[PDB]
Amino acid sequence: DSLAPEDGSHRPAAEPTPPGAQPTAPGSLKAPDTRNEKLNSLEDVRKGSENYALTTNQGVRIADDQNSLRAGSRGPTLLEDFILREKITHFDHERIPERIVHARGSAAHGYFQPYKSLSDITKADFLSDPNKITPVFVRFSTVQGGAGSADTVREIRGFATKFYTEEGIFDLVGNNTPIFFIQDAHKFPDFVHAVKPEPHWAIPQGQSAHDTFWDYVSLQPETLHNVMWAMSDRGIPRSYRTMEGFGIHTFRLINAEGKATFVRFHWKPLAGKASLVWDEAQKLTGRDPDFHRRELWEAIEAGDFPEYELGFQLIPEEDEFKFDFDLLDPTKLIPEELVPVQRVGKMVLNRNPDNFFAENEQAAFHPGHIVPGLDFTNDPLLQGRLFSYTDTQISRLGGPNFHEIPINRPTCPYHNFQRDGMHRMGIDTNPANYEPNSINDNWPRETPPGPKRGGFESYQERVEGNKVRERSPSFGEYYSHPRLFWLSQTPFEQRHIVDGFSFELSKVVRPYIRERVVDQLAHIDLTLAQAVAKNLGIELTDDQLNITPPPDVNGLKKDPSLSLYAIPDGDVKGRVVAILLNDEVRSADLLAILKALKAKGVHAKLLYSRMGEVTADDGTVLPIAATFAGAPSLTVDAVIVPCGNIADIADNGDANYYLMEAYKHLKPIALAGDARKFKATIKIADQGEEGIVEADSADGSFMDELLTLMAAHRVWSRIPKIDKIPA
Amino acid sequence: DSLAPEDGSHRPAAEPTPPGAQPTAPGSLKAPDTRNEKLNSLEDVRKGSENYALTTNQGVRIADDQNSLRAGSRGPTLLEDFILREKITHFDHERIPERIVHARGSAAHGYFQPYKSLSDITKADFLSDPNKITPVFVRFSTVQGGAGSADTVREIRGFATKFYTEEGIFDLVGNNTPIFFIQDAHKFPDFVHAVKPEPHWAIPQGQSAHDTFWDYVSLQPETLHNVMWAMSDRGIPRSYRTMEGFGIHTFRLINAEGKATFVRFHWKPLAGKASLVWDEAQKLTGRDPDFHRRELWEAIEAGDFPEYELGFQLIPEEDEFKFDFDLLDPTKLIPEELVPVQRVGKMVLNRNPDNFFAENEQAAFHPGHIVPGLDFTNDPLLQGRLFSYTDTQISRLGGPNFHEIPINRPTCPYHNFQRDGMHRMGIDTNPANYEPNSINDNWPRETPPGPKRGGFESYQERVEGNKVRERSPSFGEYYSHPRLFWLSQTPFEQRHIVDGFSFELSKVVRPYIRERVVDQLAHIDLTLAQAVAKNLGIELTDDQLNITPPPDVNGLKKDPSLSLYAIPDGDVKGRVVAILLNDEVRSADLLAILKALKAKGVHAKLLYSRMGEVTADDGTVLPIAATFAGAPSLTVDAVIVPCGNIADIADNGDANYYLMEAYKHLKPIALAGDARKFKATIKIADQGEEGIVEADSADGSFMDELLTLMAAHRVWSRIPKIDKIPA
Ligand code: HDD
Ligand code: HDD
């Protein structure tokens, strides 16, 4: 019975459409022509539905899926109802353990290709030829929260890429900041337990704003560098498309000659760097907890494919000890002013998955999954990570056959003597399950290392030392990198770092922990230490005021690539504007607005005080995407109010509040004709203000001004004006 | 090392303390003297820590828990480091599958006691004597969201009680509304899949405001009754302490003489019925996603023990068919005007757990766990539930020995012939593992049914009919219950219902689904259907305007017990007030305010624009709990502003917005002396308005008037005035 509408409006058109224009759908139905070797190889397990009978898992057609079998229509359910028991049994066992960390994440399929051959520095096959494409599957995530927690929390973000290469899977499992909080993997459980919800009551979710986190940080100054990055606006990215990615550790590249080059991996967002502001980010965790998940999915459905440039910081082996920090310490970054990022290739995410659980939830990434041409280093954090990502999926994915789950399967050949395990799919026909064997003439056989298609051989690094549980003395410096980061931020980014620390330490119940953290900031920078202390009602002592600042990092007093905004990198394609309608919209304003937005690939959402439709002055029927309250200004990049019958919305509380929230969060606002009467709500300027576009009508010049503001992301000059506004 | 502060301020006093006064802590350290039989029985597994050496799990003392074992202090980590591998292995497998539904939940320990013996109607031992105390463990929950989702979502809430009786565990697994969405358990996976995050992208979390939910609802009219309850303010409770609890299904009580009485279970909140308003609840999911978990835990630490009265609706076997609805249909409630709730006993929750994972996450409740004196009925939703809750713990809790996990163990004797299974703890010494046996003289033995301490025997209900997969025709009525609920609500409750439907349908992307739900609403009540249609820009057709309304339920046109607020049941103890400080508070106002609140058990939180302290006019040093942005008005029940230097915060945007937010959400606000200058922020007349307390000082009747407002919970008369207001 219950069937599709006559008009076919239940199903999304299979073509690129702007956010909200059609219901979202599984990738293979939304973009059936988008393919790559990995996506094609998943065809053996994709299951359709249209035109097929409803059955049990054993293939028996079901006649009545609305009722249990009972003795009489008001009688007891019978144990012989196997249809009911299979159905409820499968439901009863749907859930698998979520990831220990990074349980909340969003993923997509795409492809990668190098700009030129890197055969002089690496024999890795996926980087050997500019016209050789490698399928990828990428998962972005938060760290602390559960799989059902919110997206726009303040936290480091994960950025994991699975490269399905011809010589094996390579997983590049990184984060959105260039360093980690801790130095040795043995402390991982301590750090993670300290940031996770506290053990007695399991509070708080997705937040480092609580006593145990700041207690750990206060006792472990090695954490201060990554804590600086988390308290800055880097901890609240606007989108997964607008953040950087880093492998953090120094790895090695190995060429066909056997030469090792130290390398740090980078991803540069071709959409530019952009972050929310705290009040915005926190409120958005409640208005739309799935904001980043949704935004990535919709950008891909709209054709705004997330694009990232892979880059390498390369250090010759003979320069291992030439910096004033250890290259193997993951709490230290390598300034781009000392070692530039060489561009390597481009990654494009162009298709969403079909089933989130099957492809995203069960995907398994692991930094140990390297290929010939790559190798590790002794970084003590990376060294212990190698143990954990294989170990954890024995419970998470139920066994050692996790490489047979469709999303994890290599697309290149895989043959060996491993057998059995839970849910074994592969049926081995080799007469032998051991080597050396004569009964199958020793196949499959080992392969000597070589320039291409060779077996994996570890670089023969020289090891000299006693068996010790000891931190290297070279890792014992905790304040110079934090300071380099601080001085490289713009004045408004510095204020937001101060505000992040102040907000988080205000939620620490035990005051001495706050004091201890303030003492640590005084070892980094006294201006920062004093601004935080002032917000906590703390007075620095005379000793604290005399702590000597840490040395500069190799002579650097700042490095602009550490800042999100110092060097302009705005890109408006894929951004979104809210357009506040009225019941008699001036169609000439809307025409000019939409045309200019379209030309720069910026989307719009038409909002009103009710759903349904409104009719413009020329009879155009305008469908409403959402109400003012239903899609708050938190969800858009700018707000435009066209003329028409402004009296209709002039006294609307939500419409006025929409503009006050956008104003507070530093977003560009554009007001045309009678819409300029809303300037009184945002109680400011009469001759106009930088950041507020106004004109008798919406024209080419009005739209050019708005789009120029949007390319600079936010109106930072308005900061001084927002803390009086009651919003 | 000896890291704690010498003043001993790292540790919370072991005595009842108001919310925010000390750091929260494990139940047994916070209230060591609070005991019960179950709490005492868990002492065999409680583990301390103070003064013990740090070890491996095998008991080997660890010397250096800061580093991995490596060859050289900058060398590679060695595989022989078993201390590192055990510690990371345990971390790597910490997580277990979350509950399929009700994954988000907060729990506590308590006790129950009947008011009088109920031996005339049931032989259940826990109900046989007013001096028999039964330990309980209660878990409150949401339904759709994961364990890391937010508390204050719009949804039904779970209310599960484990009764540790002398004759077995009895689990009463109910919800906060008296009916469920569906009639037969076979449809549980369809209904749950429709409400859970959609399968392609796993959005949205914690929300029924999406297409698949409303699609299923539109095609299955049996769901309308519980959907009405969810769309009302019942869907957003202020606290687990202020909501009702229901078993939903008709069960049986069996007495010693073998007589069966039909029974429906109720829990009445002794703190009264109270809910939030949608904008507040939604925003509170961002500002504090753990608000309910937090409020429960803090209530117990403050001595505001959650108290509930167990009540029974009792219906004689001969009256089975005397109502307009089927007693076994879980989508129908039994109006209290037809069958009163008989008061049975009281439950008091008075201790938090020690470890959330061990006691809360691993607890297993199942409605099939009944005891002699209780029995089931043929309700087709309850019949299928009996299969699911034993089945699901085979994956959730790892095996069939889940009754051996400490929190789940019976406190009464358990002996049988069951053996082995994963994680087996009990070591059986019986020579036999089968019966009948002669080798252990048939022990343990079967026990005949009897008045007390007898074996379980099912009531011999007559069963007659053919084996059919058929819904009883008596369940085919879907609109009279929804209509009875609607007519029982106050006018402001009806508006909140209209708003709930309107908001949720506005997030449904496919317009025809909105239209189809509106058509179902037209079968319930025309006023409701017109108001929702108007908010969606939908016009009812002439056919919809003439749909005849469903009949009354057994002659009733309303039942005030269905309303949260029609009949005042206000209780201020355990509520909390925000007090907005300034840098020279009139100490006389604060003395009056705080002492009046304390005499009624109402908590306070002193807020300011920074942390630390402020000094009152007389030199009193005032400790600040949180900033205005740090502890938003969403978290309190009322706001009071004392006189003093009001110029200090008069122009603070946050302080003004604090009042605008509380005013919008209908909370009582009290302004003393010069604090009346904030009247212009919320546009209050010179003469004043009901809901705003104002005077020259906080003396005389100022606090009594504020407390009277708190007793009515919210200022419903202000709704028309908030309509506008930009907040
Ligand atoms: C020693 C243990 C340990 C340490 C020191 C780290 N982590 Fe890790 N991480 C794990 C133990 C692990 C894990 C327990 O193995 C996880 C969750 C389960 C999973 O499959 O892998 C994981 C997941 C995980 C993910 C999610 C992959 C996904 O999307 O499935 C990413 C992005 C990171 N980690 C990144 C980092 C980076 C950049 C680190 C430091 C530089 C780091 N991890 C240190
Ligand atoms: C046939 C399946 C089925 C049906 C029809 C119901 N549920 Fe259920 N529910 C389960 C399948 C289940 C479950 C899969 O077995 C769960 C989840 C995990 C668990 O242990 O139990 C569960 C958990 C569960 C919880 C959580 C207990 C805790 O806190 O752990 C409560 C409060 C409810 N349910 C209440 C209800 C009520 C009042 C129902 C209708 C009257 C309902 N359920 C119908």
Quick one: A581 and A523 in the same domain?
Answer: no
Same domain, B368 and B501: no
How many other CB atoms are found less than 10 A from the CB of residue A286? Answer: 23
Indicate the angle between helix axes A491-506 and A511-521, nearest 10 degrees: 160
* Chain-centre distance for alpha carbon A346: 17
Nearest ligand, measured from the Cα of A138 = 1
Catalytic residue among A102, A266, A292, A713: A102
Nearest to A131 by CA among A118, A120, A119, A115: A115
Q: For residue B417, give the H/E element and its range.
A: none
- Three-state DSSP state, A433: coil
For residues B557 and B586, state if they share a domain. no
A596 token code pair: 């200019």
Spatial separation of the C-alpha atoms in residues B88 and A404, rounded to whole Å: 25
Residue B401: count of CB within 10 angstroms of its CB:
18
Claim to verify: residue B256 and residue B393 sit in the same structural domain? yes
Coil, helix or strand at residue B139: strand
Question: Which tokens sit at A494?
Answer: 């510095």
Q: Which residues contact A256 (CB under 8 A, 6 or more apart)?
A: A119, A123, A450, A451, A452
A2: nearest CB among B87, B219, B467: B219
* CATH, residue A591: 3.40.50.880
DSSP state of B725: -
Distance CA A272, CA A238 (A): 11
Q: Do A537 and B630 touch (CB under 8 A)?
A: no
Question: How far, in Å, CA of B633 to CA of B682, rounded?
Answer: 14
Longest dimension (CA), chain A: 91
Distance, in Å, from the CA atom of A701 to the CA atom of A695, rounded to the nearest integer, reads: 9
Listed residues A366, A393, A410: the one ending a domain: A410
Cβ(A282)–Cβ(B284) below 8 Å: no
Domain match, A634 and A677 both: yes
Residues B249, B289, single domain; the answer is: yes
Residues 376-435 of B with CB under 8 A from A: 378, 380, 383-384, 387-388, 391-392, 394-396
Strands B260-269 and A576-580: unpaired
HSE-CB for B136 with a 13 A CA cutoff = 30
Beta-carbon contacts below 8 Å between A and B: 453
- Judgement on whether residues B522 and B642 belong to the same structural domain of the protein: no
Residue A563 phi, psi (nearest 5):
-95, 145
Segments in A94-232 forming alpha helices (H):
188-195, 211-219, 224-231
CA nearest neighbour of A364 among A416, A404, A418 = A404
Instruction: Give residue for tokens 């930088």.
Output: A690
Residue B160 in 3-state DSSP? strand
Instruction: Provide CB contacts within 8 A for A596, sequence distance 6+.
Output: A700, A703, A704, A706, A707
Q: Cβ separation of A380 and B653 shorter than 8 Å?
A: no
The chain B residue lying nearest A98, using CA atoms, is B95
Ligand 1 atom with least separation from CA of A248: 41
**Which residue do the tokens 């299974």 mark?**
B421
Question: Measured between CB atoms, does A615 come within 8 Å of chain B?
Answer: no
A534 and A578, same domain (yes or no): no
Q: Whose CA is nearest to atom 26 of ligand 2?
A: B102
With contact defined as beta carbons under 8 Å apart, do B3 and B78 qualify?
no
Residue B505 lies in a domain: yes
Asked if B536 contacts A610 with a C-beta cutoff of 8 angstroms, the reply is yes
DSSP-H helix ranges across B406-525: 480-488, 491-506, 511-522
Closest to A388 (Cα-Cα) out of B97, B73, B93: B93
| Cβ pair B575, B637 in contact under 8 A | yes
For Cα atoms A284, A289, A293, give the angle at the middle one, nearest 5 degrees.
110
Least Cα separation, residue A610 to chain B (angstroms): 5
Q: Are A124 and A372 in contact (CB under 8 A)?
A: yes
Residue B15 in domain: no
| Closest among A590, A510, A271 to B4, alpha carbons compared | A510
Domain boundary among A383, A410, A437: A410
Domains of chain B: total: 3
Q: Are residues B560 and B671 in the same domain?
A: no
**The domain containing residue A158 runs over which residues?**
25-410
Tell me if B277 sits within 8 A of B666, measured CB to CB.
Answer: yes
Note the maximum CA span of chain B.
92
Pocket of ligand 2 (CB under 6 A): A 88, 92; B 99-102, 105, 139, 141, 158, 160, 173-175, 180, 185, 188, 248-249, 330, 364-365, 381, 384-385, 388-389, 392
Residues of B in Cβ contact (< 8 Å) with A723: 652-654
| Closest residue by Cα to residue A237 from A266, A271, A273, A269 | A273
Structure-token match 């952009």, residue found: A274
DSSP for A470-534 reads ---GGG---SHHHHHHHHTS-HHHHHHHHHHHHHHHHT-SSHHHHHHHHHHHTTT-HHHHHHHHH
Q: In this structure, is residue A262 part of a structural domain? A: yes
Contact A171, A162 (CB under 8 A): yes
Which residues neighbour B2 within 8 Å (Cβ) at sequence distance 6 or greater? none
Q: What is the CATH number of the domain that holds A335?
A: 2.40.180.10
Three-state secondary structure call for residue B168:
strand
B561 falls within a domain: yes
Q: How far apart are CA B628 and CA B633, in angstroms?
A: 8
Q: Of A101, A138, A349, A395, which is best to mutate to test ligand 1, by the most ligand atoms within 8 angstroms of its C-beta?
A: A101
Instruction: Write the CB contacts of A315 (distance below 8 Å, at least 6 apart in sequence).
Output: A250, A261, A262, A263, A327, A334, A339
Assigned domain for B212 exists: yes
Q: Is B309 helix (H, G, I), strand (E, B) or coil?
A: strand
Q: Say how far residue A87 (Cα) sits from the centre of its chain.
A: 35
Structure tokens at B463: 């069963």
CA–CA–CA angle A556, A558, A564 (5° rounding): 145
CA nearest to A20 within chain B: B509
Is A389 annotated among the ligand-binding residues? yes
Report how far residue B215's alpha carbon sits from residue B227's, in angstroms, rounded to the nearest whole number: 13
- Ligand closest to A140 (CA) is 1
Q: Which two tokens stand for residue A196?
A: 């996770």
CA–CA separation, B166 and B56 (whole Å) = 39
B520, B551, B573: which is the final residue of a domain?
B573
| Residue A684 amino acid letter | I
Query: Which ligand is located closest to the Cα atom of residue A329?
Result: 1
Has residue A582 been placed in a domain?
Answer: yes
Flag if A611 and B506 touch (Cβ within 8 Å). yes
Q: What are phi and psi of B626, to 5 degrees?
A: -165, 170
CA distance A68 to B384: 8
Reference B709, options B550, B581, B602; nearest CA is B602
Co-location of B537 and B607 in the same domain: no
Which stretches of B337-469 are assigned E, i.e. beta strand? 342-351, 374-375, 467-468
List active site positions of B: 102, 175
Residue with tokens 């009545």: A64
**d(C-alpha B416, C-alpha B469), whole Å:** 36
Residues B283, A283: Cα–Cα separation, whole Å: 6
Residue B305 falls inside a structural domain:
yes
The number of the ligand 2 atom at minimal distance from the alpha carbon of B247 is: 38
Q: Which amino acid type is present at position A143?
A: V
> Contact at 8 Å (CB) between B351 and B31?
yes
Q: How many CB atoms lie within 10 A of CB A527?
A: 13
**Do A173 and A156 belong to one domain?**
yes
Residue B644 and residue B589: Cα distance in Å, rounded? 9
Resolution in A: 1.8
CATH number, domain at A507? Answer: 1.20.1370.20
Within this chain, do residues B596 and B697 fall inside the same structural domain, yes or no?
yes
Residue A452 placed within a domain:
no
Strands B669-672 and B638-641 come out as parallel
In B270-306, the DSSP E strands lie at none
